Design an enzyme around this catalytic site. Structure first.
Site, PDB file in Angstrom:
ATOM      1  CG  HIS A  42       4.679   4.572   6.353  1.00 24.41           C
ATOM      2  ND1 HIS A  42       5.117   5.745   5.778  1.00 24.41           N
ATOM      3  CD2 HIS A  42       5.792   3.912   6.751  1.00 24.41           C
ATOM      4  CE1 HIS A  42       6.437   5.796   5.829  1.00 24.41           C
ATOM      5  NE2 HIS A  42       6.872   4.696   6.418  1.00 24.41           N
ATOM      6  CG  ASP A  88       3.227   7.859   4.322  1.00 21.88           C
ATOM      7  OD1 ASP A  88       2.649   7.578   5.399  1.00 21.88           O
ATOM      8  OD2 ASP A  88       4.361   7.436   4.033  1.00 21.88           O
ATOM      9  CB  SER A 185       9.575   6.526   7.646  1.00 20.36           C
ATOM     10  OG  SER A 185       9.946   5.759   6.512  1.00 20.36           O
ATOM     11  N   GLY A 186       8.829   9.703   8.140  1.00 23.80           N
ATOM     12  CA  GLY A 186       8.052  10.616   8.955  1.00 23.80           C
ATOM     13  C   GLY A 186       8.823  11.889   9.261  1.00 23.80           C
TER      14      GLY A 186
HETATM   15  O1  LIG Z   1       8.440   0.951  -1.569  1.00 22.50           O
HETATM   16  C1  LIG Z   1       7.473   1.251  -0.842  1.00 22.50           C
HETATM   17  C2  LIG Z   1       7.607   1.093   0.679  1.00 22.50           C
HETATM   18  N1  LIG Z   1       8.856   0.428   0.916  1.00 22.50           N
HETATM   19  C3  LIG Z   1       8.877  -1.004   0.736  1.00 22.50           C
HETATM   20  C4  LIG Z   1      10.208  -1.670   1.074  1.00 22.50           C
HETATM   21  C5  LIG Z   1      11.397  -0.848   0.628  1.00 22.50           C
HETATM   22  C6  LIG Z   1      11.367   0.520   1.349  1.00 22.50           C
HETATM   23  N2  LIG Z   1      11.852   0.503   2.705  1.00 22.50           N
HETATM   24  S1  LIG Z   1      13.231   1.245   3.155  1.00 22.50           S
HETATM   25  O2  LIG Z   1      14.309   0.892   2.317  1.00 22.50           O
HETATM   26  O3  LIG Z   1      13.397   0.976   4.522  1.00 22.50           O
HETATM   27  C7  LIG Z   1      12.946   2.911   2.941  1.00 22.50           C
HETATM   28  C8  LIG Z   1      11.907   3.600   3.645  1.00 22.50           C
HETATM   29  C9  LIG Z   1      11.683   4.942   3.448  1.00 22.50           C
HETATM   30  C10 LIG Z   1      12.493   5.693   2.550  1.00 22.50           C
HETATM   31  C11 LIG Z   1      12.293   7.075   2.322  1.00 22.50           C
HETATM   32  C12 LIG Z   1      13.090   7.768   1.430  1.00 22.50           C
HETATM   33 CL1  LIG Z   1      12.873   9.440   1.120  1.00 22.50          CL
HETATM   34  C13 LIG Z   1      14.129   7.093   0.732  1.00 22.50           C
HETATM   35  C14 LIG Z   1      14.330   5.754   0.939  1.00 22.50           C
HETATM   36  C15 LIG Z   1      13.520   5.023   1.844  1.00 22.50           C
HETATM   37  C16 LIG Z   1      13.724   3.635   2.055  1.00 22.50           C
HETATM   38  C17 LIG Z   1       9.966   1.171   1.246  1.00 22.50           C
HETATM   39  O4  LIG Z   1       9.813   2.379   1.451  1.00 22.50           O
HETATM   40  N3  LIG Z   1       6.309   1.748  -1.429  1.00 22.50           N
HETATM   41  C18 LIG Z   1       6.136   1.863  -2.841  1.00 22.50           C
HETATM   42  C19 LIG Z   1       5.033   0.851  -3.212  1.00 22.50           C
HETATM   43  C20 LIG Z   1       3.732   1.181  -2.499  1.00 22.50           C
HETATM   44  C21 LIG Z   1       3.990   1.143  -0.997  1.00 22.50           C
HETATM   45  C22 LIG Z   1       5.142   2.093  -0.642  1.00 22.50           C
HETATM   46  C23 LIG Z   1       4.488  -0.196  -0.542  1.00 22.50           C
HETATM   47  C24 LIG Z   1       4.266  -0.583   0.763  1.00 22.50           C
HETATM   48  C25 LIG Z   1       4.761  -1.837   1.229  1.00 22.50           C
HETATM   49  C26 LIG Z   1       5.456  -2.639   0.383  1.00 22.50           C
HETATM   50  C27 LIG Z   1       5.713  -2.242  -1.004  1.00 22.50           C
HETATM   51  O5  LIG Z   1       6.349  -2.938  -1.829  1.00 22.50           O
HETATM   52  N4  LIG Z   1       5.203  -0.980  -1.428  1.00 22.50           N
HETATM   53  C28 LIG Z   1       5.454  -0.573  -2.810  1.00 22.50           C
END
Ligand SMILES: O=C(CN1CCC[C@H](NS(=O)(=O)c2ccc3cc(Cl)ccc3c2)C1=O)N1C[C@@H]2C[C@H](C1)c1cccc(=O)n1C2
Ligand SMILES: [Ca+2]
Ligand code: NA
Lengths: 233, 56
Positions: A42, A88, A185-186
């Site tokens: 991603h 991912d 991330s990554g």
């Molecule tokens: O929640 C996510 C992606 N995502 C969305 C915003 C909040 C956060 N960003 S962050 O706070 O910058 C962040 C980013 C990475 C992190 C890694 C660790 Cl170890 C811990 C905390 C983190 C927080 C985040 O990772 N997914 C779960 C599901 C399926 C995928 C992936 C998806 C994709 C797109 C929208 C969505 O709603 N969803 C919902």
């Protein structure tokens, strides 16, 4: 990283940082060898063209052992899914070989079965990166590291609004306000075993940063060990 | 009823790194960049910056 400690000289030598056209850090990576970085699929979607910085510990200064490498080949996993972030994972092959030195060295790749029984059953692993220090803050200019407890899959799934697949695992704290965050991330999740550090995960996603009752979600590297090895051939 | 810890399940079978049981005995192996020592347990780095070591 929210919480945790600053990475001291030579403590996280396998950290890589992905930088955009503007020389800004946007994602992390792990050094696997002279020619290869491990990162999250991603992350590739986050920047048009990018490069890889190594030996970097302080974005504002010139580290000295610091170096920029260009990407020759990007190998994204063909099963990656924007809706779930399953699979991912990506591998980067660099145009030129990394020079190992103080603050630049590869993490070990474990064998799958041994990794599952021995590494993944330790209490904790370490995560690191230049990501935000608060949920709504700016990218860090200092590399940080954070010891994160392994979480059992049950607790993990129950706490999660979304599907935790077999290619993911949870780590972190239920309440304690420490976690990875946007921009991590990554990056590396590594596990120490008898003074040696092995790649165990890739920073993937979380519902917020360090929120109560929530956890960081990582790509389970053990699930792709064979693929990763294919990638480097 | 929990198994008694033996072989690789007992202190990683005394290996530095990878432990597997074969022919009913402990066998040790090493990540790339290491070679198994003469005792067949320890792993020795074969070069200057071996993987997974902090550069202190
Ligand atoms: O929640 C996510 C992606 N995502 C969305 C915003 C909040 C956060 N960003 S962050 O706070 O910058 C962040 C980013 C990475 C992190 C890694 C660790 Cl170890 C811990 C905390 C983190 C927080 C985040 O990772 N997914 C779960 C599901 C399926 C995928 C992936 C998806 C994709 C797109 C929208 C969505 O709603 N969803 C919902
Ligand atoms: Ca620097
Ligand atoms: Na938490």
């Amino acid at each position: 990283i929210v919480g945790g400690q600053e990475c001291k000289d030579g403590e996280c030598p396998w950290q890589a940082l992905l930088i955009n056209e503007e020389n800004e850090g946007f994602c992390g990576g792990t050094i696997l060898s002279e020619f290869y970085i491990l990162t999250a699929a991603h992350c590739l979607y986050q920047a048009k063209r990018f490069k890889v910085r190594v030996g970097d510990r302080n974005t504002e200064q010139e580290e000295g052992g610091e170096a920029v490498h260009e990407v020759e080949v990007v190998i994204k996993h063909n099963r990656f899914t924007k809706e779930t972030y399953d699979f991912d994972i990506a591998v980067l092959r660099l145009k030129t070989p990394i020079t190992f030195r103080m603050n630049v060295a590869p993490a070990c790749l474990p064998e799958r079965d041994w990794a599952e029984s021995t590494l993944m059953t330790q209490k904790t692993g370490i995560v690191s990166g230049f990501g935000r220090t608060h949920e709504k803050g700016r990218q860090s200019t200092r590399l940080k590291m954070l010891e994160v407890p392994y979480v059992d899959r049950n607790s993990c799934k129950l706490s999660s609004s979304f599907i935790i697949t077999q290619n993911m695992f949870c780590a972190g704290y239920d309440t304690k306000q420490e976690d990875a965050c946007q921009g991590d991330s990554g990056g590396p999740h590594v596990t120490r075993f008898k003074d040696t550090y092995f790649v165990t995960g890739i920073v993937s996603w979380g519902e917020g940063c360090a929120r109560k009752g929530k956890y960081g979600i990582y790509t389970k590297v053990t699930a792709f060990l064979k693929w990763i090895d294919r990638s480097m051939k | 009823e929990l198994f008694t810890r033996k072989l690789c399940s007992l202190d990683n079978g005394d290996c530095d790194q990878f432990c597997h049981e074969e022919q009913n005995s402990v066998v040790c192996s090493c990540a790339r960049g290491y070679t198994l020592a003469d005792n067949g347990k320890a792993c020795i780095p074969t070069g200057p910056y071996p993987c997974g070591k902090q550069t202190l």
